[PDB]
């Protein structure tokens, strides 16, 4: 969708800074969260880190 793409564009380099190799996969996963959780991700470095690591071990297990 047009809106989730804009979200994804803002989120992507931030995820890439922490997971250069899986940024595309992780961003797409992240974009399935509730609006509320997405907002929090945008607003909060620490909150995003938590989701990114969450996403990481869902992938590797």
């Amino acid at each position: 969708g047009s809106h989730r793409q804009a979200l994804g564009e803002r989120l992507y380099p931030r995820v890439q800074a922490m997971q250069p190799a899986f940024a595309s996969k992780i961003t797409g996963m992240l974009l399935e969260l509730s609006p509320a959780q997405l907002l929090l991700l945008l607003a909060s470095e620490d909150s995003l880190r938590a989701r990114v690591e969450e996403a990481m071990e869902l992938i590797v297990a």
């Binding site: 595309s24 996969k25 996963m29 399935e32 992938i59």
Partner: peptide, 12 residues
């Protein structure tokens, strides 16, 4: 709930 089946995202 995070989802290994989500589509991959593609920047521009």
């Amino acid at each position: 709930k995070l989802s290994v089946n989500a589509p991959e995202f593609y920047p521009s």
